[PDB]
Amino acid sequence: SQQRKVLTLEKGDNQTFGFEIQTYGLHHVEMVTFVARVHESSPAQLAGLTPGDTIASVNGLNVEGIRHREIVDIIKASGNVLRLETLYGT
Amino acid sequence: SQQRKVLTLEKGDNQTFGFEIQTYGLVEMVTFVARVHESSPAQLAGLTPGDTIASVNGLNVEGIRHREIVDIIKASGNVLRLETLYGT
């Protein structure tokens, strides 16, 4: 059983990838970043990004002990191609 | 520092509370508020996405999965009592 998925999102210059993430401190506290929304017809949806799944890594960077802002910053710095690793949330 | 909040949601007969839950495996399975709709009973009650649900109508939900919790919520009728922990 493999709950780890690797995806590639591609977009145009003045376009966004079409997804929202939220980092929550879940009480056993564990910080977990979730895909909160994926827009219909978006690059994220086309890449197969699923709402509810958790972000494991962004462009090769394990998001383990890093701030939610770091993740957003990394995504914005990624340009038109974004590499993500997710884990089954649902 | 009190991470625990107690809430009371109230709705009408032919409607829902306006929120979705998600059971996530970390102890073990934990359930949190996945989504809260705009203008909903849940939003009005202060339910906030990302908060861990500790109990429902006085029942500790620790070792319980998604469907059983939803069943409890459905059986609750128009009033629902929840205890949640800060996720943000």
Curated annotation (Swiss-Prot), chain B:
Keywords noted in UniProt: Cell membrane, Cytoplasm, Membrane, Methylation, Phosphoprotein, Postsynaptic cell membrane, Synapse
Domain PDZ: 6-88
Superkingdom, taxonomy of origin: Eukaryota
Protein localization: Cytoplasm, Perinuclear region; Cell membrane; Postsynaptic cell membrane
Keyword Glycoprotein: no
GO BP term, example: signal transduction
Primary residence: cytoplasm
Record flagged with keyword Phosphoprotein: yes
GO terms for cellular component: glutamatergic synapse; perinuclear region of cytoplasm; plasma membrane; postsynaptic density; postsynaptic membrane
UniProt GO MF annotations: identical protein binding; PDZ domain binding; small GTPase binding
Tissue: Expressed in brain.
Described purpose of this protein according to its UniProt entry: Plays a role in intracellular trafficking and contributes to the macromolecular organization of group 1 metabotropic glutamate receptors (mGluRs) at synapses.
Summary of subunit composition and partner proteins: Heteromer. Composed of TAMALIN, CYTH2 and at least one GRM1. Also interacts with CYTH3, GRM2, GRM3 and GRM5.
Designated name of the protein: General receptor for phosphoinositides 1-associated scaffold protein
Species the sequence originates in: Rattus norvegicus
Residue range from the parent sequence: 96 to 189 of 394
